[PDB]
Amino acid sequence: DEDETTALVCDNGSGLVKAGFAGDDAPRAVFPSIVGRPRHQGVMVGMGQKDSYVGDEAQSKRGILTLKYPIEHGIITNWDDMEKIWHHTFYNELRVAPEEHPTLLTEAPLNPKANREKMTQIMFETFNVPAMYVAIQAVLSLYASGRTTGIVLDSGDGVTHNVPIYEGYALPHAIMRLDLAGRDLTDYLMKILTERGYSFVTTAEREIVRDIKEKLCYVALDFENEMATAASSSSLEKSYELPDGQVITIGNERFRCPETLFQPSFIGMESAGIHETTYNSIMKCDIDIRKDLYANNVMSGGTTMYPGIADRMQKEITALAPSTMKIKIIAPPERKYSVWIGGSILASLSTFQQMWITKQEYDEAGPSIVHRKCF
Amino acid sequence: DEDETTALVCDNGSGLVKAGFAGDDAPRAVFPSIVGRPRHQGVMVGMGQKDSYVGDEAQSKRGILTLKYPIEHGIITNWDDMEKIWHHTFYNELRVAPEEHPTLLTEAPLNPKANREKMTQIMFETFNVPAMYVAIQAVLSLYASGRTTGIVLDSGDGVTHNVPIYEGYALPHAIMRLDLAGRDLTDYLMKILTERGYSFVTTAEREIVRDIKEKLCYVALDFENEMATAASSSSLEKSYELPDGQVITIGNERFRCPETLFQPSFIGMESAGIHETTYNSIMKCDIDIRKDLYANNVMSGGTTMYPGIADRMQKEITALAPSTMKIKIIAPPERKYSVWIGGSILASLSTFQQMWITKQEYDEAGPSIVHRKCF
Amino acid sequence: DEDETTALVCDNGSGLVKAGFAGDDAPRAVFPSIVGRPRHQGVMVGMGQKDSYVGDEAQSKRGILTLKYPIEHGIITNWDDMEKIWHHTFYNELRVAPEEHPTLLTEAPLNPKANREKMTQIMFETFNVPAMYVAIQAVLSLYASGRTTGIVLDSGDGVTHNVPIYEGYALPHAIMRLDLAGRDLTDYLMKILTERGYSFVTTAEREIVRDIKEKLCYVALDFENEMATAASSSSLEKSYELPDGQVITIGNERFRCPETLFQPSFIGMESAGIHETTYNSIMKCDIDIRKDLYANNVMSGGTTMYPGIADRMQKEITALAPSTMKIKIIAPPERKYSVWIGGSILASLSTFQQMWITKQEYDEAGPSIVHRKCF
Ligand SMILES: Nc1ncnc2c1ncn2[C@@H]1O[C@H](COP(=O)(O)OP(=O)(O)O)[C@@H](O)[C@H]1O
Ligand SMILES: Nc1ncnc2c1ncn2[C@@H]1O[C@H](COP(=O)(O)OP(=O)(O)O)[C@@H](O)[C@H]1O
Ligand SMILES: Nc1ncnc2c1ncn2[C@@H]1O[C@H](COP(=O)(O)OP(=O)(O)O)[C@@H](O)[C@H]1O
């Protein structure tokens, strides 16, 4: 609180907002992106509740609330709800006066121009920021990495991409999309557990299943052989206590759930699994740069956090590639916050501080400015 | 009683067993699935009563008895009780020697493998059937229909499903579940009648309320406008004589009870009403097959028997679908026995007689056989 | 069905088989070249479906099926699938007995010798044709035209060529290749529509986009000025109803998609646009024959069907050529079937009937015969 200034790095996630100050090593505020007020709301004797805050309160308030994601699949679809999320971010989580900070916002891949313009309009008109930037989330991640060359497999919450990069450039024609990512894997685990006679269907039960997924699932060494071991499997049958206190047993569901990344037909997806899309992406590049891609396969995103994933990707890529090809899979430790960190590096870039968009630019060429000939 | 043979078609319902001979047009035996013996049992001077027969005796014996459904929510949960129901089916209702007849059994959606194996074990070991098949009840219904394409709304006793079908295949990812169906509507009518100062709480009173529901409830043309007419409603106020002989008056409860299918929040269900699930199911299918689904919405199940339901579904679907979409609701007349009829067609399928499971198959690969690579 | 005979003219296209009788004015059978069976195949209650017929059934059966082209990029790559396509052609579409008809087959430019030999082996051994010929598809088209001199721009489904011709001879060193053609333009329209927030990614969605392309795209008068008019463009914003019934709006995508033929960098292609390749081809010819080429630029192929293409080519060629050069663009009306018609003329050539290849020639010098010293 003086001269200088930082850069409000707000990564608008499909399920979680990550926000903080440029220059910090990780976001200081992480809260669910949802909207929820009592679904039954039966009055009582007073009030003192906040209608649809969701954020952190919701979670801990599981069972009372309803949820909505105004950013459900990564694109913002409800501006009144998004204004509530940004107000919460600035005033309740970070506890800042937004008019004192240049703010860098992230946007999903394929975000419409008109959507970026509405984001810009709200920042300047509603929150009175002195400036702002919009950054592409994949791009920020790439930034955080620091690798000019290599092929990234980025699997997050709602989408997975394979992005080959040569000298810093995402050759746009090589990238392929997959709908599936963590949101789909949590829904599939709810369904397969419901196969055993359990019942996980409510909003609260979804949260419970997301926790089972993140704590007990793993990727097999070989799907077929893991299924065969399931028979005499005395390991798989882990126990998990529900908040009600009942204890369920989870066995082959531990590896059947994430097997979907390699076999999208488990959820009905025709798409090619992540090892096939990696190969298909490398084959859309020049033959010449393929050796550099094969030796620099970088994993990113929350859904690449499973133990065993790098070794499995090494095995599968080795099976598809030429016999003399050197293959290397890199996974950065704390991948998931790779998107926020790239934003932090960019926003905290004094040297490229002219890329931030300003109140004068917005007034001159409206918000589009932050879209036409920059970010 | 000679060569050839029929197929024992036993549809194990949550509230009613439907059983008969393959090839008959409808089941010859329909009896409540319950277990009940005197709750007070005060001896007397002799016996000559059957402990927990339930079946038909129970009903007519209302007030003395207790009830249990070993198939309460569609999945068999008590094998000693289920053995009693099957013994009653074979020896008391159909009056057959089970060792002379291949028998097709039905099972609920999501029935565990181990449950199908126990059903199979009992048929072969306890009843000595020469063969048997297990069939999926929804599937049998689909079979009875005869429509390859279209979206079915099947509302029965304990569950309601929306199932889109293209060329005979239930695209498994499109189907959505609802807990609510007729069991819930009877419980809700007991509760709302208890609001007027009446008291319907016992087992006998539940049966009385199920009769009021089936004889006097109806679905409104528009819920809001029907409530508004309730004021000057001189029609609604129908009379119903209780077995005690008192006469109650039923008015807006006639349409408030089934309104729950369209507004599950009446019983506290967050779920989306049946018109919303229909739309949500069609939107999980390819855009291309949607025109075929919209023109082939087939209603099935006992809870789709209300007069007015097809016209209301036509109105609601028309309001959600594109303006140029051709919408058609089909309701087969005697829907409820749609499940038994599909079983009868399948079981009575000489041409597919190799799908029946045999005593040799059970002995070789145990009962699982009737589960792994068939039904 | 008597003496004489016709010539089975089968044009094996990358996406469509065109087949018929020599002497007919157009092919009597046109069906997609694909292979597809249920991707989900969920059994049901019977069969009566044909595993991977594709042909016409597929299309109308959009959403159920998968596709494969055994001729994906013009060269046949799977002989078991190709045998199915030829069986369908003869027995289901044309309804002929192939052993009664000399059959002329077409092959892509640069088809390997061994591939032509395998085509020949199948015709004689599998279908028992009395004779057969293999013809080069470009060549057949040239044949259909009837112009000895001039430079043809032939843009079809998977490839575009510029072919200068002087007295009937394709000076082989002048011809240049382009990967891009209609297959690429349909893929690019799917991608650019997905930019607006729509989602066209499935096999069924590809077919939908191919229809939007063929019905609503057009080539601009000037790309830069058309983009500038897009702003106040109230024309562009045509509506298109999807099979689901939703209605999308298409605007600048109408001309951005085919702009790729003139600017291959839109899809990442370094190649020179079709006006530059025309000029580059004319400059590889003698200076002396250039006046004849400039006055005889003939358009051929499905991708030259856009309204406005001849006028745009006249404008662009005029801008590159010497000021006193007479420039004329010819487009034959029903260009697309230009390949089949050339085959029909050739095959129906009684006078050159000795060029057909016979069962004795195949037995003597194997199939190669139809390759070494003829077609
Ligand atoms: N340790 C972990 N193991 C597996 N999945 C994880 C782990 N940590 C986070 N995830 C999942 O990663 C997803 C979030 O990843 P993220 O990269 O932030 O996604 P997005 O950027 O698409 O919002 C969620 O589905 C979450 O459950
Ligand atoms: N005419 C009717 N009107 C309304 N509900 C009916 C009618 N006939 C039967 N039902 C109800 O339908 C339900 C039984 O339907 P059914 O399809 O057999 O269910 P399930 O297969 O789930 O056992 C019961 O709740 C019953 O009261
Ligand atoms: N009227 C049209 N306008 C634009 N493209 C068209 C038209 N008719 C056909 N096409 C396209 O032309 C291509 C087929 O042309 P064709 O000459 O048969 O190709 P090929 O011989 O390479 O198989 C397809 O991409 C198709 O969509």
Author numbering:
A (entry chain B), B (entry chain A), C (entry chain C): 1 to 375
Paper excerpt:
Troponin and tropomyosin control the interaction between myosin and actin so that contraction only takes place when the intracellular Ca2+ concentration is elevated. Each tropomyosin molecule spans seven actin subunits and interacts with one troponin complex.
The first set of 408 filaments had been treated with EGTA to induce the Ca2+-free conformation and a second set had 138 Ca2+-treated filaments. At elevated Ca2+ concentration TnT1 is docked so that it is angled across the outer surface of the tropomyosin coiled-coil, while at low Ca2+ it appears more closely integrated with tropomyosin, running parallel to the coiled-coil where it may contribute to the positioning of tropomyosin in the blocked state. At low Ca2+ concentrations the C terminus of TnI, including residues 176–184, an area homologous with the second actin-tropomyosin binding site, wraps across tropomyosin and appears to interact with the adjacent actin subunit.
